[PDB]
Write a structure and sequence with these properties.
The PDB classes it as oxidoreductase. Keywords: oxidoreductase, dioxygenase, peroxidase. The assembly is dimeric. The structure is a homodimer. Chain A folds into two domains: about 40 residues, Laminin, CATH 2.10.25; about 500 residues, Haem peroxidase domain superfamily, animal type (Myeloperoxidase, subunit C, Orthogonal Bundle), CATH 1.10.640. By secondary structure, chain A is mainly alpha-helical. The radius of gyration of chain A is 24 Å and the shape is globular. The first copy, chain A, has a two-stranded antiparallel sheet with strand order 1-2. In chain A, strands 3-4 form a two-stranded antiparallel sheet. At the A-B interface, strand 1, helix 5 and helix 11 of A face strand 1, helix 5 and helix 11 of B. One octyl beta-D-glucopyranoside binds next to strand 4 and helix 1 of chain A. One protoporphyrin IX containing FE binds next to helix 7 and helix 15 of chain A.
């Protein structure tokens, strides 16, 4: 008998429980729907859905009428909407977390074993006819082929939103604190046990490593002076494990939180800015609290940067990426009246989705000089050569490529996308259309409806066989972009919930922690409350370059 | 030279004392409902609320009186209304996410994330204070041992007036030893029970490897053995798990269970046997319903069912007995679905102190005509299989347990534990009993007599401590006067309840996300939880059904 749950019978988040040898049951508890497949709505569920304007309609209003938005951004209504975006978006992400690579059911082990990435939809039952359940071909498209046909960059397509490399590297740096797949354990396993903005990519994903990077004086982090400038310490001074190519000596490697950050000047640039920033804040506190020791200085410094990080991400990073006219705001207090759980768990779907590799350019222009991937990648000297200001101004001026759209991943890193597709299949992620529905969208009815065109659509169709067999990642990247946008509808509708929950679900956002004393007084508190990308860079550099997420 | 201003505990109503400069301090009264330098000026509403709040003692009275009136209420919707009130009101007293730990008397990411630490409600007494308790009392605290033989040592056995028995005393020990599991290797303030709550790790193991060792790996079942045609935990030979049995005891005589320490007492191993029986039983109920299920899902779903069974019996029978209320307590996770509640819990060190209910233990253990001594009971690897579950359950269910509050009621055989508790309290540098009184919404004692309710002990305690404001946390709890005909006094309830209710309702299975019939494998597993009962727990797992209760007949 075919596993009845391969048909994904239960709608609206209802749970498909298998009974007997051939039956199944949908647990529609609190779905707002009744019936065998959770399809008969309640009068209230019926209104709400039938009155909800499409994602596209909303996106429109948010990116138009600058004049209207200007007023709004100046009234209490800005908060009202910000609170709405926050709650509405978050309800989509389950808390406490549900399934993991090992359990497609709730279990104490899933709830407690933090080494697993969680997942929103259980996997495609291993006993289904096809790889995606019931539809599609018995074999899925060669990952590599699929990668060269539709993802490979032919000619560079820049992002129309004006996003640059300063933002592209910020995203890479940022996300690599919570996405840290255990190579030793396999897919579905993470080393980033903080599952969120713990700033472990600065301090270490484990206590020992933290102690190694710590100066143990004034709460300061170790470092070194080169050209009279401050840079991360050497692997010699701070004997921490880093991933540098064989043959590179300790004395020649810089020690930072994330082991992998040595493979790119853009990453190590950001590691330098934040190391600079931690020690700076350590001084502000010491002045205020001479009685404080190293630990408390260190500990309070870390909480301040965590707050700084969450602010800049919401108000500048996400502001850029959304391209909204509504002025986003970071105020943990808008949630103090809501029923919100300050807890977060990195989902595997979120890791797939954040493989924004198409951002990377064809080359890296640093002034009159233009560097190749082969000159940029692994270059252990470019940062100290140019210095923070020089690289920040550079990345801030060079445009980053479009994310959504198709065929815009530079050939040098196209292997990553191939791997992402293969991993998706190991994890046995459900079809793109299932996630569409799961995140409140209607599933695509044709490959053309998805792509918005006819060439690719037709080939994808002849490859997948059924739109209902289109995979999660390919579907996200090949889906048509919103007009003049960096990506399309799905990336926002699916990525935002995961994103907003992970920022607001941080314990420092809870009323219990959001107190001036948590940060060491008004001083530390305002550092958080007023954090800004320019301040972050500029208060830590001899001069202040063009610093922005938008290309000039 | 300048005395740490925070040794004076300046900030009232939960305001935080932040030290500034070399000699200043500041109180963070953010959201305390009080303003001012020391968080002392209330807001109109805070003022009303406090000035209109009837005392703990008044409330306790109403709750234990007017049965006929309680009988009517218990039958209206008014029972849920109050149950929800008790739940929310009680819980707000416990911070979430957690705050301080033995290492940080400030909020920090490490405290928030390092789960090896027990948390704490009040930061320690600054190491730079004049006296050990801050500002008051003598420069040296009472000898722990002395203090223990004068006021805590049992002269004559005082039974609990509430009718609590050994079935309950052992249930409490078994239960609490799943979340209280101090790391001997790491020292005080460190726990091995990383579940920080009702994870049933004292059945399954506090770590994955141990779990795998105890698992049969068939039908989701747990390993076990047949002795006298009855089921008992497997041998350490069969399930090579580390247990704490004195050197010299054959492994052939060691039973392997979740909690390493449960071999020290027939009462503990009795309960480990009932639950092992119960897990496998539920495994069968599910397999029947889901033939397609594998071992893991059977195992996993079985464990969630017993976690629910455990939380129900604790609230409706265990806490019902202990409180002695006429209001019929209820376990319905749904009463909290409208409240702002965080489904998260973290074991506090103060909770560990408070739960050292050692005075419950009797002078000897009567099992029928036979009466056993501590030397025949403790570490007796054969009494359980000899007598069997039914025989011991009926026994413990009939023998009364001793009063907890009051003083002079800890049997000499285990009085050392209380001595250690007092010494540890000082390592952790817990604040004075009066501080916690206030912290949990009570007015601090003004005299040793007001606390004890008499004059003899009071006067000696006074010449020992010097100031009531120097009375330590644990001694204060045990020496404080009991509510009339109660097992303990006001503080044990007002302080222990918040910690307790939060830890039961803060379990993830109580969240709307998990409280679904599918979480338990269908209506079947769901009702097992919804209808759990002490008698069913025992009796559905024993050839016969003995007198089984938390109340002595
Ligand atoms: C010079 C450009 C970059 C290079 C050389 C690069 C290379 C890689 C490689 C090799 C992997 C490792 C796993 C695999 O082989 O599948 C990977 C994974 C990943 N990359 Fe990049 N990447 C770059 C930029 C970015 C950017 C701009 C982002 C977007 C924020 C990003 C996001 C990710 C994510 C989230 C993962 C998975 C991390 C994990 O599971 O631990 N990468 N990248
Ligand atoms: C036969 C009776 C019992 C004996 C032999 C006994 C013995 C002990 C001993 C030796 C300690 C170990 C640490 C120390 O030496 O300070 C201890 C701790 C403890 N006991 Fe008991 N106990 C008994 C009954 C109970 C009961 C009835 C309860 C009440 C529920 C209880 C609650 C506790 C708690 C919570 C701890 C601390 C656990 C930890 O920190 O890991 N004990 N007990
Ligand atoms: C609920 O969904 C099921 C499955 O989608 C529908 O019934 C059939 O179920 C069998 C076995 O699961 C499948 O092989 C078929 O594909 C389904 N047939 C059809 C026509 O969909 C069923 O119609 C749905 N029930 C209700 C009440 O909507
Ligand atoms: C979290 O879950 C993983 C996966 O089960 C655990 O790792 C396994 O542990 C068992 C028992 O120690 C080993 O036999 C396996 O080799 C491990 N598998 C993997 C993929 O590493 C891990 O130990 C769990 N962690 C905790 C803290 O419970
Ligand atoms: C690492 O980056 C440095 C630049 O910071 C590279 O050296 C420069 O190479 C360009 C050629 O494109 C020359 O015009 C510059 O004069 C060089 N400057 C210095 C200071 O060497 C270096 O070649 C890069 N390393 C690798 C392996 O490509
Ligand atoms: C706030 O509480 C303090 C301490 O209980 C009161 O007086 C302080 O006394 C301590 C010990 O003698 C000294 O360290 C301080 O210098 C005193 N206070 C201050 C503010 O410096 C103080 O009067 C209380 N303030 C109010 C308004 O009640
Ligand atoms: C949780 O905190 C404890 C206490 O700091 C950590 O244990 C210490 O770890 C350091 C670094 O490995 C050692 O030098 C000490 O010997 C340890 N102290 C104790 C009392 O064991 C522990 O490693 C932390 N655990 C995690 C997972 O972060
Ligand atoms: C362990 O408990 C058993 C009872 O289960 C003890 O054996 C009994 O001891 C009493 C008094 O000592 C005798 O009157 C009974 O005849 C014994 N009963 C049985 C079934 O043997 C045993 O002595 C205890 N072990 C220790 C070391 O004290
Ligand atoms: C004002 C009262 C309006 C009630 C409208 C109820 C319409 C419910 O429409 C529902 O749509 C699903 C898909 O077609 C079906 O599976 C349900 O049987 C059907 O009732
Ligand atoms: C306006 C024409 C259709 C009106 C249908 C109104 C039905 C009232 O809806 C009620 O909703 C409750 C949950 O919200 C259910 O428990 C009740 O059974 C249902 O009757
Ligand atoms: C102009 C309307 C803005 C609505 C913002 C909330 C987004 C809800 O999004 C689902
Ligand atoms: C709600 C209070 C009822 C108190 C009854 C006290 C008289 C009976 O006391 C028994
Ligand atoms: C009789 C009044 C009982 C009120 C609910 C108990 C809340 C106790 O909270 C202290
Ligand atoms: C605030 C806004 C919204 O909820 O509409 C929003 C928030 C977050 C994202 C976002 C999506 C994917 C990765 C990172 C950020 C996004 F695209 C849009
Ligand atoms: C329900 C009731 C209440 O809140 O009043 C209640 C709840 C829990 C306890 C309790 C106190 C200390 C240890 C274990 C349980 C208690 F004594 C009373």
């Amino acid at each position: 008998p075919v596993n009845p749950c391969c048909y994904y019978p239960c709608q609206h988040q209802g749970i498909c429980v298998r009974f007997g040898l051939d039956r199944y049951q949908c647990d529609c508890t609190r779905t707002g729907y009744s019936g065998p497949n959770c399809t008969i709505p309640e009068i209230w569920t019926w209104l709400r859905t039938t009155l909800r304007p499409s994602p596209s309609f909303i996106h429109f209003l948010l990116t138009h009428g600058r004049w209207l938005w200007d007023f709004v951004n100046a009234t209490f209504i800005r908060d009202t909407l910000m609170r709405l975006v926050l709650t509405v978006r978050s309800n989509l992400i389950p808390s406490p977390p549900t399934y993991n690579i090992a359990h497609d059911y709730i279990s104490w082990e899933s709830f407690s074993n933090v080494s697993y990435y969680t997942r929103i939809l259980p996997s495609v039952p291993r006993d289904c006819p096809t790889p995606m359940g019931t539809k599609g071909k018995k074999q899925l498209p060669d990952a590599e082929f699929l990668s060269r046909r539709f993802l490979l960059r032919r000619k560079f397509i820049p992002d129309p939103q004006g996003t640059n490399l300063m933002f592209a590297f910020f995203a890479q740096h940022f996300t690599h604190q919570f996405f840290k797949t255990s190579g030793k354990m396999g897919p579905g396993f993470t080393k980033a046990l903080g599952h969120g903005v713990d700033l472990g990519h600065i301090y270490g994903d484990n206590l020992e490593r933290q102690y190694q990077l710590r100066l143990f004086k004034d709460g300061k982090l170790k470092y070194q002076m080169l050209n009279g400038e401050v840079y991360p310490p050497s692997v010699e001074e701070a004997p921490v494990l880093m991933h540098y190519p064989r043959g590179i000596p300790p004395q020649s490697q810089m020690a930072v939180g994330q082991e992998v950050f040595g493979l790119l000047p853009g990453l190590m640039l950001y590691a330098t800015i934040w190391l600079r920033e931690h020690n700076r804040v350590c001084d502000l506190l010491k002045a205020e609290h001479p009685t404080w020791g190293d630990e408390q200085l260190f500990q309070t410094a870390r909480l301040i940067l965590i707050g700084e990080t969450i602010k800049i991400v919401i108000e500048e990073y996400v502001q850029q990426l959304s391209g909204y006219f509504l002025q986003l705001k970071f105020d943990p207090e808008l949630l103090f009246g809501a029923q919100f759980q300050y807890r977060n768990r990195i989902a595997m779907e979120f890791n797939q989705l954040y493989h924004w590799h198409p951002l990377m350019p064809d080359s890296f222009r640093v002034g009159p000089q233009d560097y190749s991937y082969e000159q940029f990648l692994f270059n252990t000297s470019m940062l100290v050569d140019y210095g923070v200001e020089a690289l920040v101004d550079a990345f801030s001026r060079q445009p980053a490529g479009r994310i959504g759209g198709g065929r815009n991943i530079d050939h040098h890193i196209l292997h990553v996308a191939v791997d992402v597709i293969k991993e998706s299949r190991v994890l046995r992620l459900q079809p793109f259309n299932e996630y569409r529905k799961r995140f409140g969208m209607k599933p695509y009815t044709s490959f053309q409806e998805l792509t918005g065109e006819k060439e690719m659509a037709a080939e994808l169709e002849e490859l997948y066989g059924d739109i209902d067999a289109l995979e999660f990642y390919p579907g996200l990247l090949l889906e048509k972009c919103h007009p003049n946008s960096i990506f399309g509808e799905s990336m926002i509708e699916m990525g935002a919930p995961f994103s907003l929950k992970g920022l607001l679900g941080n314990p420092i956002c809870s009323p219990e922690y959001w107190k001036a004393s948590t940060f060491g007084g008004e001083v530390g508190f305002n550092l958080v409350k007023t954090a800004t990308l320019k301040k972050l860079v500029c208060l830590n550099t001899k001069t202040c370059p063009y610093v922005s997420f938008h290309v000039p």
